[PDB]
A paper describes a structure:
Previous studies showed that proper introduction of disulfide bonds could stabilize the flexible region of target proteins and reduce the conformational entropy by locking the protein into single desired conformation. Here we developed a comprehensive disulfide bond prediction algorithm that not just increased the success rate of predictions but also improved the quality of crystallized target proteins. We applied our method on two proteins which were previously determined to high resolution and frequently used as fusion partners for GPCR crystallization, cytochrome b562 (BRIL) and Flavodoxin, and verified our prediction by solving the crystal structures of the wild type (WT) proteins and mutants. The theoretical and experimental results both indicated that with relatively lower values of conformational entropy, proteins would be more stable and readily crystallized to higher diffraction resolution.
Compared to WT BRIL, three mutants (T9C-A36C, V16C-A29C, and K27C-A79C) show relatively better or similar diffraction resolution, lower conformational entropy (ΔS) and comparable B-factor. These disulfide bonds are located near the middle of helices I and II (T9C-A36C and V16C-A29C) or between helices II and III (K27C-A79C), thus directly strengthened the linkage between these helices. The BRIL proteins with disulfide bonds T9C-A36C and K27C-A79C have lower entropy, consistent with better diffraction qualities. For BRIL proteins, the distance between the N- and C-termini exhibited small fluctuations expect for K27C-A79C. For BRIL proteins, the simulation B-factors are consistent with the experimental values.
Residue numbers in the entry: 1 to 106
Write the structure that this text describes.
Amino acid sequence: ADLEDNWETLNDNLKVIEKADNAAQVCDALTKMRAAALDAQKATPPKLEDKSPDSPEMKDFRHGFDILVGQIDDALKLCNEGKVKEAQAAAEQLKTTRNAYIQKYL
């Protein structure tokens, strides 16, 4: 699985969360999102393949993932307390982070 696969795993699990009926279903999908985000964070996106590994752009990319992972953790805390609707709303905001931090490097 590569970065493109990781991104599409995030997309599929966002759909799972949107369609979910219970906290356990949301938790499972957030787990897969967290795993895919950890995998993606270690990749080099195509627009940064020539850039220095410590370039500001590569920092932006990796830090977008630390922010995304922290937000996934906040959503996991909600679904671990049974707060399904709150967790689903939080998952929607994960789209904003993904789009603003990461998409420009794909």
